[PDB]
Amino acid sequence: GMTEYKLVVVGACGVGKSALTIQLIQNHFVDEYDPTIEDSYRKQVVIDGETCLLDILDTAGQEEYSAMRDQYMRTGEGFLCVFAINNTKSFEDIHHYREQIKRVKDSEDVPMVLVGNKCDLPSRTVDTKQAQDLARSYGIPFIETSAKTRQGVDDAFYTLVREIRKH
Amino acid sequence: GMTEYKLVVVGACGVGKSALTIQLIQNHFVDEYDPTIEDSYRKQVVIDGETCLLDILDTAGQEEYSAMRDQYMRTGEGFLCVFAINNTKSFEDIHHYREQIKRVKDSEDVPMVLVGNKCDLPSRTVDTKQAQDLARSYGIPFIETSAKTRQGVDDAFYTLVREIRKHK
Amino acid sequence: VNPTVFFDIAVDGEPLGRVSFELFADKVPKTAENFRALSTGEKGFGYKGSCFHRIIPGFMCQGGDFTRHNGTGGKSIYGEKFEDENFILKHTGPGILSMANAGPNTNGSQFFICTAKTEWLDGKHVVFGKVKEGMNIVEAMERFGSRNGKTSKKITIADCGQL
Amino acid sequence: VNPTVFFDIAVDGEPLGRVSFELFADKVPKTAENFRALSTGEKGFGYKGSCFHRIIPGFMCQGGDFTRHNGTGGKSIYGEKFEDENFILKHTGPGILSMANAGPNTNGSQFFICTAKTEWLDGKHVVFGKVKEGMNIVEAMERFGSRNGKTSKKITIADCGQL
Ligand SMILES: CCn1c(-c2cc(N3CCN(C4CC4)CC3)cnc2[C@H](C)OC)c2c3cc(ccc31)-c1csc(n1)C[C@H](NC(=O)[C@H]1[C@@H]3COC[C@@H]31)C(=O)N1CCC[C@H](N1)C(=O)OCC(C)(C)C2
Ligand SMILES: CCn1c(-c2cc(N3CCN(C4CC4)CC3)cnc2[C@H](C)OC)c2c3cc(ccc31)-c1csc(n1)C[C@H](NC(=O)[C@H]1[C@@H]3COC[C@@H]31)C(=O)N1CCC[C@H](N1)C(=O)OCC(C)(C)C2
Ligand SMILES: Nc1nc2c(ncn2[C@@H]2O[C@H](COP(=O)(O)OP(=O)(O)O)[C@@H](O)[C@H]2O)c(=O)[nH]1
Ligand SMILES: Nc1nc2c(ncn2[C@@H]2O[C@H](COP(=O)(O)OP(=O)(O)O)[C@@H](O)[C@H]2O)c(=O)[nH]1
Ligand SMILES: [Mg+2]
Ligand SMILES: [Mg+2]
């Protein structure tokens, strides 16, 4: 039987977590804002010649519920830590996310991938070097995506699966 | 906020796990056989004058998937162990479920309630004192229920919540 | 004086019951009038025919999207969005009626009815009413909710107006 | 020669594509004839208009309840249920067409199409066909499934018949 991979998409609100997930699962774009309470998806794929089953938890970034992320981090295998290229606070929030997962699962080597969505945007506030810098300290990759054109969507999720296989 | 109780309904295929749960949640009796894959429900209730939130997992009784009960047994807080009073085999399956839950939870003290369902049916093969004896030997309550008439439906779930509170 | 409005709720088209609300026009006259006018439809649009798209047992029932009918739309009688009027009233318990939003000053037509105390929403959503009659119907709506709010049946406002 | 049948699949009324199946009348003539007759509708009833009610990514797509349209019903051309013809053929991989049931000798009209190898169903479900053309339609149907099989859109057999 094919292996199952439990991926968790995290990040602040409106950064595009659902827009990325729906593009992967449904191959269409959600232009309207439908804020997520919590959603789960299933998708079978071939990554590097192996058929595998992706279990994807799409989470809510509302700060009021930041104390409740412990449960889904204890069950998840890999984490797609999403900020937006035009949201400085979302960049600063990634530290609390990583420290949460480190403490929840009791490890410093947890598969993660940094995703900078809204690459198509005609603005910016977060540079790519600082992304790769924090990524080089944790030991994780970085991918720029756009759910409107589907750029980098497949790459983002597949890189995280490859990171789980190493652990 | 109100306390949330993670209840799991277990037992052989076709004993009435889903019928019991849907009566609790929707006050409606499903007379058709819709075999469950997995289903979760929520309901807020008042038990002994305190409001709480029931989270109920409806499980699959198929024997081909018996080695896959591990994850839901680890996260569940209390277990409704259902057999049908007209199905001797389902009563015998109860022992295997309890042994699993003990083995998965690494404990002899797990909040559990034994439920003999379909007590509206005219021809039982498991006698009430027989299930009462097994419940006593387990140190857990026993309740006869009917998802068709709603007899003991609220009682079974509420008694499970009371068992969990004492476990605290 | 505080007006009173009613919803006639249906489940998969079958009538369920009437819920009435008192609208605190004495504390939030602008928010209350928006809900009142949308309940009567006197502006040419409103809640009649729309559904409750989100029902989370133990917390609240949310509805009010009559423009898109997917939980992302809705509009007020003052335009697409209007400002938070005030936060005098708080989410003190079941039956509280309050405005849904997507950030500060984004009130439209989406609302929610509390089925329990939700004090972490105080200062963030404008409370403007409370269930007067028919709290049992709101409790009955919870039979078709779920953990993330997806409903198992179509819960609609078959009729609505002012009492 | 084995007969061939087609399904025209629609998603919320929008056409998705045509799937065709070869039915192994040489190995399971009674089970193949049931599925063939239900596809044409020649007995006065059959699959046209019925939906796929259970889709689980990584495993299968299940449909065929044309009597109750809720996953509990369906009927064969020999009565409500008929016996297990044989278990010669195995669930060897994607595209396999096989009969759903509720235990031994309860074949009705519900069927399933594997999207992977499901070898633990061998000897328990009668295999009687395989996808001939349009496997990618079946794969596209997966995107509307879920862990417990509930579908996010209505997947229907908009039309069907024998080629
Ligand atoms: C972490 C899980 N989780 C919880 C939660 C929390 C708790 N508690 C928190 C409180 N602790 C107390 C100190 C002890 C105990 C533990 C328990 N279990 C849960 C649930 C069931 O786990 C799955 C929630 C919650 C809420 C959101 C996202 C995730 C959430 C969310 C997203 S957007 C929004 N909220 C505002 C939204 N905006 C729009 O809809 C916009 C759309 C587009 O533009 C117009 C239109 C809006 O106005 N409302 C109207 C108001 C109620 C609100 N929706 C809603 O539904 O929240 C539901 C809920 C359950 C009350 C909160
Ligand atoms: C434990 C969870 N779990 C799984 C499962 C299992 C696995 N694997 C098992 C195999 N291992 C490999 C060798 C190692 C690896 C781990 C992974 N993840 C899962 C899922 C996603 O966890 C939520 C299943 C499964 C199936 C049932 C109940 C629970 C199940 C179930 C109930 S009734 C039935 N099955 C037969 C059913 N009958 C009716 O529908 C009746 C209706 C009324 O009367 C006419 C009509 C029927 O005929 N079919 C037609 C055929 C496929 C079949 N449905 C179905 O849906 O199975 C789904 C699924 C996912 C393939 C199996
Ligand atoms: N320009 C642009 N907007 C995006 C992109 N991804 C998401 N958005 C917008 O960001 C808003 C919020 O998207 P959402 O998926 O709900 O983010 P979430 O709250 O983290 O799940 C939506 O209006 C989306 O249209 C993107 O790649 N480019
Ligand atoms: N007469 C009677 N029938 C019941 C009762 N409970 C369940 N059933 C029937 O038994 C069958 C199986 O019920 P179900 O809940 O789906 O079994 P499950 O696999 O344990 O979930 C259904 O047709 C139900 O209508 C009951 O208390 N009385
Ligand atoms: Mg989202
Ligand atoms: Mg069941």
Side-chain angles (χ1 to χ4, degrees), chain A residues 3-73:
Chain A
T3 310
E4 187 218 347
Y5 294 102
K6 313 205 208 262
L7 326 187
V8 183
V9 188
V10 307
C13 306
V15 304
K17 299 184 298 296
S18 303
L20 289 179
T21 301
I22 296 158
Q23 270 267 68
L24 176 77
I25 304 294
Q26 300 261 68
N27 234 48
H28 71 80
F29 177 65
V30 282
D31 35 2
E32 335 191 293
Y33 181 38
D34 182 28
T36 304
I37 309 300
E38 190 201 271
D39 287 302
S40 298
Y41 301 87
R42 285 290 184 101
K43 190 194 165 53
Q44 75 162 297
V45 290
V46 182
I47 297 156
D48 301 339
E50 149 161 291
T51 307
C52 58
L53 191 293
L54 307 192
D55 193 278
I56 300 171
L57 184 70
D58 182 27
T59 71
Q62 276 71 19
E63 288 167 14
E64 172 53 39
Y65 314 117
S66 65
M68 296 155 74
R69 300 131 165 196
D70 291 2
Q71 177 57 94
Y72 74 63
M73 295 167 164

Side-chain angles (χ1 to χ4, degrees), chain A residues 32 35 38-39 64-65, chain C residues 68 70 72 120 124 147-148:
Chain A
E32 335 191 293
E38 190 201 271
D39 287 302
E64 172 53 39
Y65 314 117
Chain C
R68 305 193 164 141
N70 64 13
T72 73
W120 62 96
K124 293 160 179 172
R147 185 162 161 279
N148 72 349

Side-chain angles (χ1 to χ4, degrees), chain B residues 19-32:
Chain B
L20 284 174
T21 298
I22 289 156
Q23 272 289 11
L24 181 71
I25 301 293
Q26 318 189 194
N27 225 285
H28 158 263
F29 171 62
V30 46
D31 51 335
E32 271 152 2

Side-chain angles (χ1 to χ4, degrees), chain B residues 8-160:
Chain B
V8 180
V9 190
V10 306
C13 190
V15 296
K17 302 181 296 300
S18 297
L20 284 174
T21 298
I22 289 156
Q23 272 289 11
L24 181 71
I25 301 293
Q26 318 189 194
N27 225 285
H28 158 263
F29 171 62
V30 46
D31 51 335
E32 271 152 2
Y33 183 37
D34 184 16
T36 304
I37 304 297
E38 202 195 80
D39 285 286
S40 305
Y41 304 89
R42 274 166 114 72
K43 183 202 202 180
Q44 68 165 296
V45 293
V46 183
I47 297 169
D48 303 329
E50 85 149 71
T51 305
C52 53
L53 173 50
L54 312 187
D55 177 294
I56 304 162
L57 179 71
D58 197 3
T59 68
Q62 273 70 23
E63 269 173 20
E64 164 57 41
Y65 310 117
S66 63
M68 294 172 84
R69 298 169 190 155
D70 280 19
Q71 180 53 258
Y72 78 66
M73 276 177 200
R74 288 193 282 277
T75 47
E77 277 165 13
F79 298 87
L80 214 65
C81 295
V82 191
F83 70 95
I85 52 99
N86 65 338
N87 185 346
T88 297
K89 169 70 137 193
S90 76
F91 181 63
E92 304 253 320
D93 298 333
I94 284 310
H95 190 229
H96 307 285
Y97 276 103
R98 192 170 146 90
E99 278 305 301
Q100 268 193 292
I101 297 160
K102 285 170 26 185
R103 169 153 27 88
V104 178
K105 287 219 170 282
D106 216 23
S107 177
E108 303 301 301
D109 188 45
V110 182
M112 291 190 19
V113 176
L114 184 78
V115 177
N117 191 43
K118 310 200 193 192
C119 66
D120 59 289
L121 291 180
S123 196
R124 67 166 56 223
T125 49
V126 185
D127 294 319
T128 287
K129 192 161 165 291
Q130 190 173 359
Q132 231 176 297
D133 284 350
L134 187 73
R136 207 151 30 232
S137 100
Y138 291 165
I140 70 183
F142 167 60
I143 292 163
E144 284 197 317
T145 64
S146 163
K148 185 173 188 210
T149 66
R150 313 197 83 260
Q151 171 157 51
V153 166
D154 284 356
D155 190 17
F157 287 97
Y158 289 13
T159 304
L160 185 47

Side-chain angles (χ1 to χ4, degrees), chain D residues 25 28-35 77-78 82-83 85:
Chain D
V28 278
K30 184 165 185 187
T31 307
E33 166 62 17
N34 178 53
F35 191 91
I77 63 167
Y78 318 103
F82 69 106
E83 61 286 343
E85 192 165 14

Side-chain angles (χ1 to χ4, degrees), chain D residues 7 9 21 34-35 38-39 45-55 60-77 79-82 97-101 106-113 128 141 151 155-157 160:
Chain D
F7 287 175
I9 306 303
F21 312 81
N34 178 53
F35 191 91
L38 295 168
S39 301
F45 51 86
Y47 290 135
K48 180 177 185 169
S50 73
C51 62
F52 289 78
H53 63 279
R54 171 180 296 154
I55 300 179
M60 29 66 51
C61 306
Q62 174 170 349
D65 182 357
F66 60 84
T67 64
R68 299 161 165 183
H69 308 114
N70 65 9
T72 73
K75 67 175 151 173
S76 90
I77 63 167
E80 293 327 86
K81 291 144 162 49
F82 69 106
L97 181 62
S98 174
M99 285 304 283
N101 65 61
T106 61
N107 296 296
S109 56
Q110 289 194 44
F111 61 89
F112 65 104
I113 311 154
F128 65 99
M141 268 148 89
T151 62
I155 316 289
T156 55
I157 300 165
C160 51

